[PDB]
């Protein structure tokens, strides 16, 4: 079949998988934010 | 995120909605293969402690009336709604139970043998040796755990002093105190073993996923040149 369209957008799924609240739930996710803040990212999370 | 559906504290006769597992545990991983989908079902809270006196009543033999003998999706046997006093409770039905029958639930330990009528619950001491029994409990007050399937009846082989020997359906002999309560008779749906599934779809209606397609004596040193 034709590939390349593995992305089926959904705002509920997106904010649940990669959102602010999700990232802070576990210590490893908090360190994801810490790295991005140190790097200077304009977007810490979705 | 797995929260067990078995969270209802209080007994009721209303059928309760069940959530299916799929063979997976609270971790989310398969722990048993071959379970999945099937028909949606409701759980009717069975009561296996036959001699449960009604609340605020004395502990002596009582009687109950059989309202209906019904099909149960969650077990091989069939269930009977029984009413006595102001209480209704589901119970397992014996081979010959019909609506309108009356069944005794006795606490008294008969010093002599008591005539056995199918469906009545008596302590093993009361019953005579050889009587077919079902819904046996290991210890007084525990509740019935053995001989609870369809048409499965065990025998009471022997009674000596304060204990008796029970022959479980597997032919494995078990021993229990004569105070334990055992229901008389067979367990109904005796032909369950005669049922024919017929088509692969029928097992997928009962929640049975198909089997997977994947298709030991170490010799001692003195006997390795002959292997």
């Amino acid at each position: 079949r034709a590939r390349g369209n593995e992305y089926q957008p959904s705002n509920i799924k997106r904010k649940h998988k990669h959102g602010w609240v999700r990232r802070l739930s576990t210590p490893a996710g908090v360190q994801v934010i810490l790295r991005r803040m140190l790097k200077g990212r304009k977007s810490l999370s979705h | 995120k797995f929260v067990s559906w078995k969270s209802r504290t209080k007994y009721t006769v209303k059928p309760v909605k069940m959530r299916k597992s799929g063979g997976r545990d609270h971790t989310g991983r398969i722990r048993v293969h071959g379970i999945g989908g099937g028909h949606k079902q409701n759980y009717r809270m069975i009561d296996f402690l036959r001699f449960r006196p009604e609340k605020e009543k004395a502990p002596e033999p009582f009687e109950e009336k059989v309202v209906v003998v019904r099909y149960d999706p969650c077990r091989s046997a069939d269930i009977a709604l029984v009413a006595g006093g102001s209480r209704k409770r589901w119970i397992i039905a014996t081979e010959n139970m019909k609506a309108g029958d009356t069944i005794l639930n006795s606490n008294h330990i008969g010093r002599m043998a008591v005539a056995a009528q199918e469906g009545d619950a008596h302590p093993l001491g009361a019953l005579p040796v050889g009587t077919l029994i079902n819904n046996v409990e290991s210890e007084p007050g525990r509740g019935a755990q053995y001989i609870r399937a369809a048409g499965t009846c065990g025998v009471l082989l022997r009674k000596v002093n304060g204990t008796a020997i029970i022959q479980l359906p597997s032919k494995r002999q078990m021993q229990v105190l004569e105070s334990c309560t055992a229901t008389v008779g067979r367990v109904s749906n005796v032909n369950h073993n005669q049922r024919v599934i017929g088509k692969a779809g029928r097992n997928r209606w009962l929640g049975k996923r198909p089997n997977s397609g994947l298709w030991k004596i170490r010799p001692l040193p003195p006997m390795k040149s002959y292997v």
Binding site: - | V3, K6, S7, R8, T9, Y11, M45, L49, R142, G143
Partner: protein, 77 residues
């Protein structure tokens, strides 16, 4: 005697009290002053809270036996 309600689904028992409370004469140091939880200080014990007035949206009734119309004799309705 099968009891309905699997233990996992029951509300969990309160956490065991800090051992500093056992020792008599000793005043525990807790995070009450900070006004927030911290894992390395002792857990405060607060007295029951009274709003000082009745809020209709959060009314809570008295138990059955404390009701004015409570009667020991049973009425079948």
């Amino acid at each position: 005697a099968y009891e309905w309600g699997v233990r996992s689904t029951r509300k969990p028992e309160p956490r065991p009290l800090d051992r500093v409370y056992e020792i008599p004469g000793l005043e525990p140091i807790t995070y009450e002053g900070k006004k927030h939880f911290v894992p390395w200080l002792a857990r405060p014990i607060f007295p029951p809270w009274e709003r000082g007035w009745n809020d209709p949206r959060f009314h809570r009734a008295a138990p059955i036996h404390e009701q004015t119309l409570y009667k020991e004799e049973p009425c079948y309705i």
